[model samples]
Target chain A: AAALSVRNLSPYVSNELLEEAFSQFGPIERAVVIVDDRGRSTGKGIVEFASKPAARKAFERCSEGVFLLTTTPRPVIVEPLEQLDDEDGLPEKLAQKNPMYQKERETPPRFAQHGTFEYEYSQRWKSLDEMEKQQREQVEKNMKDAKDKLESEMEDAYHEHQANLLRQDLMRRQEELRRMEELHNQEMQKRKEMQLRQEEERRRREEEMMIRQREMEEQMRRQRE
Target chain B: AAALSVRNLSPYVSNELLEEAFSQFGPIERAVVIVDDRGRSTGKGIVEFASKPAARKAFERCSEGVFLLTTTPRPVIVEPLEQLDDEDGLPEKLAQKNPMYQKERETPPRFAQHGTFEYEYSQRWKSLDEMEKQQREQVEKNMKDAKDKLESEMEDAYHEHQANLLRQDLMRRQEELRRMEELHNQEMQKRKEMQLRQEEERRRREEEMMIRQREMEEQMRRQREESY
Candidate 1:
C-alpha cells in the first residue's frame, strides 16, 4: 500500500503529542519534524503513514488548525505535494490564456499543463528504453501535442489542472478569512466584557459620589440656618 | 552567433513593455518567461539575442532592475540560463553553514555572488565537461572517504541538489534585503524634511504667542496704575 506524505508540520508539537494523536489512525512509518538549517526546530516537518488510508485519514483530521499557544499563529496549513504542471495558480492565467492559447504555435505544450500529467506520465512510462529516443522524439512530441491540444475542447485536461489550483487558492484565502473572523470575534467579545465591567464599576462609583454630594449639601444648609 | 536566452522576466510586465526595451538588445528570436507549477512568475525568462557580443551587451546593460518604470523596481538582473544543478549552489552553501536554510528554501534565487558560468555547451566541449566531472567526482570521493562527512553532509546527490537550492535562495534574499534598505533610507530622508518644515512653523507660532502674552501684561499694568 502506498504511504501518505505529510509536509510542513509544526515543530512545536512534541513527538509524543504527534504520536498520541496520529497513533489513533494507524502506524506511522516515519514522523519527522524538519528542523531549520541551524538544526533548530523550524516548526515544520513531515509525517508519513504506513497505511495509505491512515495517511488520508490523518490529512482529513489534521490538515488545518492546531493551536499550540494563544500567542502562536494558527497552525500552518497542510497542502498536497505540489503538482509539477500546476495551472490556474498563476495570478495572470486569464490574461495569458487568450493570447497564449489562441494558436498551436503560441500555446504551451500539453504535458506542460497539470491536467495532462497522467497522459504524459503514462506516455513516458511506455517508452523508458533508449533514453535518447525518449528525450529526442517523445519529448518533442509531448511539447507539440500539448500546444496542439490548447485549441481543442479535449484540452479540458488543462482546465482540470487549472480548476484544482484555483480551488486550492480559494480554499487558502477562505481559510485566512475564517481565521481573521475568528480573531475578530474573540477581540469583540473581550471588548464587550471590558465595557460591561467598566459600566458596572462607573455606576457603583456614581452612586457613592451622589451620596457624598447629598451629605455635603445637607451640612452646608445646616450651617446657613 | 547564438541568440541570448532571457530567463525570469517579470510575468507581470506586459509583453509590450518587454518588447519595447528588448528591441534595443536585438531582434528577439524567441522569448519565454518561465513560471513555476503555480503559474506565478518565478522571475525568470528567456531572451535569445542575435550575436554573442550583443547577448553579452544586453545581459550587462539590461540586467534585473533596469528598464522598468521608476515606480516599479530598479535595474534588471539578467544572466545566462544554466541547468538547475549549476544554478543551485549558493543556497546550499548557507545550508551547509546552517540548517535554518531549509525553512526558507522556497525563497527566490538570484545572483548573490556574481561569477562567470562556464558550462559544457556541447559534447564537443569535452574538456570542460571532463573537468566538471572530475571536480564533482573528487567532491563525491571526499564525501565518501569521510563517511561521517557525507551523512553529516547529505545522502548522495541530494546534498548537491540541496546546496544548489540554497544558492538561489540566498541570492534572492540578498536582493530583497537590498530593496528594503533602499526603501528605509528614502523614508528616513522624507521624515527629516518633514521635521525641518514642522520646526520652522513651530518657531513662528511661538513668536506669535509671546507677542499676545506681552500685550495682555501691558493691559493689566495700565489698569493697575489707573486704579491706584
Candidate 2:
C-alpha cells in the first residue's frame, strides 16, 4: 500500500469527511486525520491506498481544490509519505568524518562521574546514612543564616522605601498647597480690580447724569427769566 | 512706552511672576501672560513698561537665565514687540487693489441693508415663522421615520447576530462531539486488540506448558523402566 501525506486540511474537517472526500478518487485502505492528545485536528492527514496508481490519482485530484466544512475552498498538498519522511543526513555524516570535526572532539572530558558513584555503590548503608545526616544538618544551618540575613536586608529596604514614599507625598502636598494659595491670590486680585473698575463706571455715569440734570434746570430757569 | 514680547516663559509661570520679575527693571505699565480660555498659559507674555529704556534693560537681563519655581534655570527670549509685530502688508495691499479683485466684486448684490428693510423685515419674520413651522414638522417626520427604520434594522441585525452565534456554537459542539466519538471508538478498538493479543499469548503459554508436562512424564516412565 502507498501512503500519501496530505497537508492544509482544516481543523473542522473530520476524518470521516476526509475519507469520504478522497475515497471518491480511489479505494482508500486507511484514512487518518492526525490529531493531538486533545483530539483536535493538526491540519494534516494521511491516506493510504492499496495501489500506488490509486494513491497517485487521489493525490493529483485532491490537490486541485477541495471544499471542506468551511465556505471558502482550499487546496490540498499531497506528497508521497516516503518523500515527506526522507532523511537528508548524508552531508551530516560526511561532516562528522572531516578532520575539523575530529579535532573539535579532542578536548579532554570536563569531569568524571565515577568517584562519588563508585563510593556510593561500595559503601555500607549505615555509614552512608550517618554522612547524609551530617550533610543535612550543615545545609540547614547555612540556610538559616542566609534566611536571617535576607530578612534583615528586606526589612531595611522596606523601611527606606516607606520613608521615601512619605517624603514624596509631603512634597506633593506642599506643591499643591502652594499652587492653590497662588491661584487664590490671583482670584482675589482679579476681584479687587473688577470691583474698582465697576466703582469707577458707576461714579462716572452718576456724574454725567447729574451734569445733564443741572443743564436742564439751568435752561428752565433762563426760559422763566 | 514700549512693549517687550517675552518668549520661553514656562507654562506654569503666572502673570504675577512676570510682573514681579520685570518690575525690578522699571515701573511696568502692564504685564500680561497670554492664556487660553481654559486658563492654560500660551508660554508667551507681553510686558509693557513706562519707558523704552526699561523694556531694553529688562530684555537684556531676562535673556540670561531666570529661575522661576523650578530648580533648573531657563533662558528668557526677550525681543522688541515692534519687531515681532511688524507688518509686511504692502504686497497684500497691492493684491487687494488689483483689477481682478474689483471685478470679482461686480457680482449681483447678495443683500441690501436699507430701503423697505422694515417691510421686508416684517414679511420675512412672518414667512420665517411659517417656514420654521414647516421645517419643524418635516424634521420631526424625518426623525420618526429614521428612528423606526433604525429600530427595525437594529432588531433584525441583533436577531441575525444572535442566530449566527448559536449556529457557530452548535457547529463547535458538533465538531467536539464527533472527535470525542472517534476517540472513543479508537479506544474501544485498542482495548479489543489488546484483549485478543493477551488471549493469544495465554494460548501459546498453555501449549508450551502442556508439552513440558508430557516430556517430564515420558522421562519419568523411562527412568522407572531402567530401574526395573
Candidate 3:
C-alpha cells in the first residue's frame, strides 16, 4: 500500500479515530495517526485506501474540516494521492521523502550533524535549518555565560576595594595612637607643651597624607577604567 | 498622519506583547489584536503604519509564517490605514469605468459598508473553515439527539410491558384463590362418601379458572400491542 500524509490533524485523534474518519469514505487498507516529537497527537491522521479513487474521495470529503470531537480543519497534503503511483507499479518518491510515510517513493534526504568537521565539508540545503537552529542556540548560550562571568568579576572587584579602604583606616588610627603614647612619655614639665605642638603637627601631617592618598586613589581608579 | 501597517505580526501577542513587538516597526497609528467569534485570539496583529512606505516595507518583511503565527495559508491584508478619499469620488463615473484604477492597479474592491460592515463580513472568510465547522456540528448534533431519543422511548416501552405482566399474574392468582374458597365452603357441608365428587368439582373449577385467565391475558397482550 502507498502512504499518504495529512498535516494539521486535530490532536484528538488516534489510529482508531483515524480509521473511523477514513473508513467512512471507503475501504481503508491501512491507517496511522500522525504525531509530533513528543508523541502527542497532532490532530492529524493519514490513511491508505485500497484504491486511488477511494483515497481521493476521502481527501476531498475531509479536506477543509470534519467533526471529530471539536471541528477539525480539513487536512492539507503537499501532493495528491494520484501522484503516489508511478510507472511499472512503483510508487513516486514522495513516500520516502516525507517523514510521515511508512514506505516513501523517494529516498529521504539526510544532513550532517552540526559542530562536526563533516558539517563544515557538507553544506546541504536540507541541513541548513538543522545547523542554524543548533548554532544559534549555542551562540546565545555562550554569550549569556560570558555576561554572567563579567558581572561576577565586577562584584569581586568592588569588595576588594572596600577591604583596602578598611585596611588603610586601621593603619592611620594605629599611627595616631602611637604619637599620643610618645607625648605621654615626654618629661612632665614639657608634656603639655609637647602634646600641643604634636597635636598641631599631627593634624597638619594627617591632612597632607590624606591629600596624597586621595591623589593615589585617583590614579588607581583611572587605571582600573 | 500616514497609516502604517505591518504585514506579519505575532498574533498570539497580548495587548502588552503586541505593543512591544510593533513599537519597533514604526510609530503606530492604531494597533489592534484581532479575535474570532469565540473570543479566542487568531494570533494576528495589525499595526497601522505612519506612512505608506512604512506599511509597504512592513508588509514585505512580515510574511505569513515568519514573524506571525499563521493558522491558514492565505496571506492576510492588513486594513488600509486611511479611509478611501472617494465621496463617491467618481466624477461622472469616469473613475468607476477606469479599468486601470478598478482592476489593473489592484485597488481594493468597493465594499458595501464604509468600514464597519466590511469588517463584519470579512470575519467570515478569515479562513475557508468556519462554514465547514458549523455545518458538520449541526448535522452531527441532530443525528445524535434523534438516536438517543429513540433509544430512551424503546426502553420505556419495555419497562411498561414488564409492569403489565406482573399486574396480570397477581390478579389471576387472587381470582383463583377466591373461587377455591367458595368450593371449600360447599365441600365442608357434604359427607366423606362424596369427597371424590367434591375433588372432581374442585379440579373442574380450577381448569375453568385457568383457561379464562389465559384468554383474558392473551386479549390484553394483543390490545397492548395495538395501542402502542
Candidate 4:
C-alpha cells in the first residue's frame, strides 16, 4: 500500500527534491528518482511512505495535478506499486546478526514493539474515510464512464482500419484484373493490325499477277486477229 | 559477314550433326553447338560460312522453318553476325613464316593467287540474286510489319503496368485518408458521450438539492403552528 510509481517527473528533478515533494503527505520511508545501473536519473521515480494513508494522500494530490513539481505544471500519472512478498521474505542472516562483533548464533533476542503507528494512523483515516464516501462514489462512477468511452472510441478506429485496409486491397485487385483485360485487348488489336498488313501486301501481289495475265491475253488476241 | 547465330536448337542435337545439317546449304567454314567456357553444349549454336551467299541461303531456310534440326520441329531464330575487324586483323607474325622451318622472314616469297574463289562465287550469286528480288521484297515488307506489331503490343502492356501500379497506390492513399476521418469522428462522439454523462450527474444533484429545501421549510411551518 505504501509504494507508488511517480511518472512524468521533470527531468531536472533530483532524488532529494522528489523526496521533499512527497514528504508533506507524511513520513516517506524512501523517495527516489529511479535510475539505470549507471546511476543516471530517469525522468520517472518512486515514493514509498511509511503508511498507506500517507501514500493515498500523495496519490490523490498527484492524480489531481494540484501539486506541481516545478513552476509550470504537468499532471503526472500515479500508480500503486504491489508488494508480492511479506516480512518473512527477508533473509534470516540479514535480519539477525546484531553481531556484537558477530556474537554466537545463539538464541537471538525476541522482538518487542508491535508499534502504535498504525493505531493512531487508523483513527486519523477513520474520520476522513466516512466523510468522503458519497462524493467518492460519484468520482468512481465518472472514472468508469470515461474509461468506457475511451476504449469504445479506440475500438471503432480499429474496426475502421481493418475495413479500409481490405477495401484498398480489393481495389488493387480489381485494377490489376482490369489491366490484364486491357493488355489482352491490346494483343488482339496488334493481331488485327498484323493481319491487315498481310492482307494489303497480298492484294498488291494479286493485282500484279492479274496485270501480267492481262498482258498475255492481249498479246494472244492481237496475234490471232 | 558470313556468321549467323542460331537459337532454339534441339538439345539432343550434337555438334557434328549440326555441322552436317548446315553443310547442305553451301560451303560452311565451321558449324557447331556453341558452348560455355566449360565446353558443354548450349541449346544454341553458330554457323560461319566461307561466303555471305552461303550464309544467306542457310538463314532463309532456318527463318522459314523449312529446314528442321530434327525429324519433327520448331523454327529457330536466325540472326546475321556483324564482322568488326577486317583480315588485316590477324597478327603479322602468324601470317608469315609457316615455319617452313618457320622460315626466316625470308622475303616471304611474294605470295601468289589472290584467288578465283570470288569470281566463281559472284557468278553463282548473280543467277540466284536476279531470281529472288521480287519475291524477296514481299518477305522483307512482311517482316517489318511483324516486328512493329510485336513492339507496339509490348509497349501497351508496359504502359498498362505503370498505370495500374499508380492506381493501386492512390487507392491506398484514399483509404488512409478515410480512416483518419473516421477516427476523428470517433473522437468527437466520445467527447459528446462524456459531456452527456456529466450533465446527467448535475441534473440528479439538482433534484436532491430541491428535496432538502422542501423538508427544511416543512419543519419550520410545523414548529410555528404548534407554538401558536
DockQ (C-alpha based) per candidate is: 0.01, 0.00, 0.00, 0.00
Residue range B1-228, candidate 3, lDDT tens digits: 344333322233333444444555566666656554434345444566667776666555443222322221112334344333211112213323444323322321122232432233233222333444454555556545653554465456557768987999999999999989988877775666588888999999999999999999999999999999
- Tens digits of per-residue lDDT for model 3, A48-145: 77887886666665443332222211223312432321111111221133232332212222223454322332232113334444555655465446
Interface RMS for model 1: 23.3
10 residues in a row with least lDDT, candidate 4 chain A: A105-114
Per-chain TM-score of chain B, candidate 2?
0.41
Clash counts per candidate, in order, are 48, 0, 22, 2
RMSD of each: 49.0, 48.4, 35.3, 53.5
Worst 10 residues of 1 chain B by lDDT: B116-125
Q: Can you give the TM-score per candidate against the true fold?
A: 0.21, 0.23, 0.21, 0.24
Give me the candidate number with maximum TM-score: 4
CA lDDT, candidate 3, residue B8: 28
Q: Whole-model lDDT, candidate 4?
A: 0.57
Looking at model 3 chain A, which ten-residue stretch has the lowest summed lDDT?
A85-94
- Kindly report the interface RMSD of candidate 3, rounded to 1 decimal: 29.3
Q: In candidate 3, which residue ranges exceed 4 Å CA deviation?
A: A36-39, A63-225, B1-228
- How does chain A of candidate 4 score by TM-score against the true chain A? 0.43
Structure candidate 4, residue pairs in collision: A99-A102, B99-B102
Reference-based lDDT, residue B184, model 3: 88
Model 1, span A6-123: residue lDDT tens: 4323333433344444566578765544444344444444555676677676566544323121111222234344322212223333435444324312321111223332333322
The models' CA-based lDDT, in order, is: 0.49, 0.58, 0.49, 0.57
